[PDB]
Write a protein that binds this ligand. Sequence first.
Ligand SMILES: Cc1ccc(Nc2ncnc3[nH]ncc23)cc1
Ligand SMILES: Cc1ccc(Nc2ncnc3[nH]ncc23)cc1
Ligand SMILES: Cc1ccc(Nc2ncnc3[nH]ncc23)cc1
Length: 186
Amino acid sequence: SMLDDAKARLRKYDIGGKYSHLPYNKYSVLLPLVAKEGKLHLLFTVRSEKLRRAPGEVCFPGGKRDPTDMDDAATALREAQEEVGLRPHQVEVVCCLVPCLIDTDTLITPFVGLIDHNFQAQPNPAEVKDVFLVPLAYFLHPQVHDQINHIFEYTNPEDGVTYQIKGMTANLAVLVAFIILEKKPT
Ligand SMILES: Cc1ccc(Nc2ncnc3[nH]ncc23)cc1
Ligand SMILES: Cc1ccc(Nc2ncnc3[nH]ncc23)cc1
Ligand SMILES: Cc1ccc(Nc2ncnc3[nH]ncc23)cc1
């Protein structure tokens, strides 16, 4: 099946816990894969305008590890629940992708999760202004705008709303698109 196939592709890029013990400032993100209408999509958040860090920008759910977290995956799952109401029984964590090094002292670990078909997002308005889906195939032929810095524009055909996707978020999205969709019969 489509889901069987996705998970088998993702498994081959799993680094697991290899870089998890290093002495960084530690954050995790969850990349949430949703099946709709015969196709895979990624779920994104728009950050609330009131936050200190990057108000109004597009990102994956996530945040800073805390002493309660059993491991780095736990951080991503805690944060996803708090931000958009995703419960643990509604997600299968499939792998841990390459971590992102920033600012000389910080390591951000991305996890890919398959989302239950009955999940409906309940955004916490203190953290998240909006939630939207993008088909995964979009990231193979995106609409690119140079700010020089590459920025993607995605227009939701349901309501005509345009979102800007950039930085680490845009990089991770293209990576997941390549892993799952490259080299497939039609
Ligand atoms: C998409 C996105 C989400 C959060 C941030 N946060 C930060 N940006 C800059 N410096 C920071 N220091 N601690 C956090 C932090 C940046 C981008
Ligand atoms: C220095 C620094 C530290 C943390 C971040 N955080 C994030 N960066 C990107 N997406 C994110 N989603 N949730 C959090 C988060 C960015 C920069
Ligand atoms: C809540 C939730 C629980 C489990 C899954 N996983 C799968 N579901 C169906 N087929 C699959 N094939 N590989 C994995 C997989 C998705 C969401």
